[PDB]
């Protein structure tokens, strides 16, 4: 049902809902793997259900509808550790393409599309063990889509190819993330 920011277990899925307070955004947990997101001249956010600890060959699985009109994301989204790493394989986007600006590293196909591959670099920013200096890895898909599989494995590997190496797995969910907009989202995922 709707929460405040928070993380935890919801019939069976491992959830993760946070923003920066700016208000605008109502969050609802639902039966199985679903989760909603309504949201209206938001801060900044991120709202999923998915596992913790993730895995590297999972195989991801979503259903839904995704309807942003601003800068908004929708992703498998995850953390490593040892080394840090934040990563997203973006399936849909609104006005802002992430990789903007950010060096190409390369391409895989997976899943029904060209990926287009990306590294940038966070300095000083809040990250799952405090503060820190870290790299991002981006899978940008390039025929957008609400619903299908995901092959983790597949773009993990591509990744590590090119050097993009990976830790040990800490949470891995798809999310909603959003940077002042407006939308609505309701995700099933399994």
Do not use: C
């Amino acid at each position: 049902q709707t929460i405040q920011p928070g993380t935890g277990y919801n019939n069976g899925y491992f959830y993760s809902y946070w923003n920066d307070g700016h208000g605008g955004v109502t969050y609802t947990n639902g039966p199985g793997g679903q989760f909603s997101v309504n949201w209206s001249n938001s801060g900044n956010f991120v709202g999923g259900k998915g596992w913790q600890p993730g895995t590297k060959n999972k195989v991801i699985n979503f259903s839904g509808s995704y309807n942003p009109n601003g800068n908004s994301y929708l992703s498998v989204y995850g953390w490593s550790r040892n080394p840090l790493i934040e990563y997203y394989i973006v399936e849909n986007f609104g006005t802002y393409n992430p990789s903007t600006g950010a060096t190409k590293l390369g391409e895989v196909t997976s899943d029904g599309s060209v990926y287009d591959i990306y590294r940038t670099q966070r300095v000083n920013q809040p990250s799952i063990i405090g503060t820190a200096t870290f790299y991002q890895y981006w899978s940008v898909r390039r025929n957008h889509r609400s619903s299908g599989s995901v092959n983790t494995a597949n773009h993990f590997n591509a990744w590590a190819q090119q050097g993009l190496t990976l830790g040990t797995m800490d949470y891995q969910i798809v999310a909603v993330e959003g940077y002042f907009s407006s939308g609505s989202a309701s995700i099933t995922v399994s």
